[PDB]
Structures are given as C-alpha cells and as structure tokens.
From TrEMBL, chains A, B:
Compartments (UniProt record): Cytoplasm
GO molecular function, one term: kinase activity
Protein name: Ascorbate-specific PTS system EIIA component
Function: The phosphoenolpyruvate-dependent sugar phosphotransferase system (sugar PTS), a major carbohydrate active transport system, catalyzes the phosphorylation of incoming sugar substrates concomitantly with their translocation across the cell membrane. The enzyme II UlaABC PTS system is involved in ascorbate transport.
Annotated GO CC locations: cytoplasm
GO biological process: phosphoenolpyruvate-dependent sugar phosphotransferase system
Species, as recorded: Streptococcus mutans
Domain of life, source organism: Bacteria
Listed Pfam families: PTS_EIIA_2
Alphabetized SUPFAM superfamilies for the sequence: Phoshotransferase/anion transport protein
Residues of the PTS EIIA type-2 domain: 6-148
Length: 156, 156
C-alpha cells in the first residue's frame, strides 16, 4: 500500500484534533482504521497494552509517533492514518508528540520494506512537523506526500 | 544494543570482501554473528528462504541491504554486522548492493525502535555508501558511527 491511496481509501487523515493524553492521542489515530475495517477493534487495546508494558516503541524522531502492533493483533489489511494535534502530548518516556501516523501492516516484511521508507520520506521534508501541523485539509497533506516521492527511500 | 559496541563485541565488521552473488553476499554478512553466537546457524537458511519466497525485504536505499529474519528463526541476542564488497551484487528485484549490515533483533519492538534509527543515521551521512566502501579498518567505520550520533533519529 501507498500512503496517498491508503489515506484516501481509509479517510484516515483527521487534522487539528485535541487529545489530553497519550492514550487519547493513540485512540484518535487508530479509530479511522477501525471505521474503515483496516483493523479489528482489538488493535487499539493492543497498542495501549504494548505501550504500557514496553514503553513507546514507535517514536521515530521527536514530534512524531507511528503507533502500531503485530499483524496478529487484528490487522485485516495494510493501511495508514494521519492525525495532527493542536498541542503536543507527552508519552511515558518523556517524549512529546504532535503528529501521529498509525500503521497497519499485514507482515513484518511489508512494515520494514514498504511502510517505513514511505513514512521516513514524508518526515524528512523540510520543517515536516511544522508544515503537517499547519495543514487544514487532507489535500494539503497529500500535496506533501507527493513532494516526498523524490526521496531515495522511494526509488525501489 | 548500540551499533559500535555490537560491532566490537561481535567482531562483525569485515571489509573489502568479494561475493559472486546475492546468496554469498548474505552468507558473508551473517557468518560473523553465527561465530559470536548472536544467532543460531539456521538464521542464514531463513534469510535465504525468506528472500527466495518474498523477494528482498531489506534494501532500504540503493547500494545497501540490512539482511534479517524473524527473532524466532534463531536470534539469541541483539547484534549487527557490517560487510562491504569490492563490487556490487544484484539482488532478485534488480537492485544492486555493495554494503551489508545484518541485523539480529530479539523482538520487532527493538527492530523498529532501536535498530532501524541507528542504521538510518549511519547511511544518511554524506556519501555514506562511498565512504563505507573506502574503509580499510574497523576503526574507520566506527569513526563514521560516531559521526552519525548527532542524527535526530538518535535523540531518544
């Protein structure tokens, strides 16, 4: 799955949301994918239980999280969402987050070779966090996704 | 596990090697970790079988591969190796590789949140592939690893 098409098909870009804490922020990012049927409802409980037991395992760079769990915890199909908050929330390891890109992968192989390269392309644009946060409409975010496509991560 | 310390403890930096094909290139990168006991011998057969059945799932950017398999396929402990070839080899998807950084992770959580950020920091240095390939001694590669430490991927 390609980011743009996942976003469109899942209607999973939801911007300018307010979360009081990390568990809420996480709920907001996965809910769009429960509604589309990309993931089962349990996927949510899994991310939270994994987070509580292990700490955040998905805060790739400061400002962003890619919340996910194992495929076996209720992924039906490959999908992504993107949620931006109006204020950062603090995760359990002291890390602040304002942008959440939830990930549903049907295998570790596609997580590593297909999903992560596309996520890192997006976030390596200049001022990617600040620009994502100033996006008002899904079309704006997708214009950013287009611009990420000349990343070396995307060549194969 | 930190890259430098994995490299030192596992003596798993082996430079200027010649491989005729992709299966050999892969053998060379994992062998150092079998010798140290980071992985069981079967880890090798797994990478090859997974590759044959799925295609390369670890060629993050052109020129490099991070060959790996699931923890259950014989990882004893977290470790890395680094192998550079004298000529590129072609993988099954048409992709050329000259640098191999084999990865042993005890869980998908550490693969994603600990191993990949460190690997991407190394490879985002300027001319990282060309500089890795001109390294003669493990100490040279480790000087590069030091220089990667100011990456934003490494801040948490």
């Amino acid at each position: 799955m390609n980011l743009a098409q996942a976003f469109k098909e899942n209607h999973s870009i939801r911007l300018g949301l307010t979360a009081k804490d990390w568990k809420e922020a996480v709920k907001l990012s996965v809910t769009p994918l429960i509604e589309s049927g990309a993931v089962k409802p349990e996927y949510y409980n899994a991310i939270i239980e994994s987070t509580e037991s292990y700490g955040p395992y998905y805060i790739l760079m400061p400002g962003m999280a890619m919340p996910h769990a194992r495929p076996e915890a209720g992924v039906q199909r490959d999908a992504f969402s993107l949620v931006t908050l109006t204020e950062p929330v603090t995760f359990t390891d002291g890390k602040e987050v304002q942008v959440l890109l939830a990930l549903a992968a049907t295998s570790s192989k596609i997580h590593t070779s297909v999903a992560i390269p596309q996520i890192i392309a997006l976030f390596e644009l200049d001022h990617s966090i600040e620009r994502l946060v100033n996006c008002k409409t899904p079309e704006e975010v997708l214009a950013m996704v287009e611009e990420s496509k000349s990343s070396p991560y995307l060549e194969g």
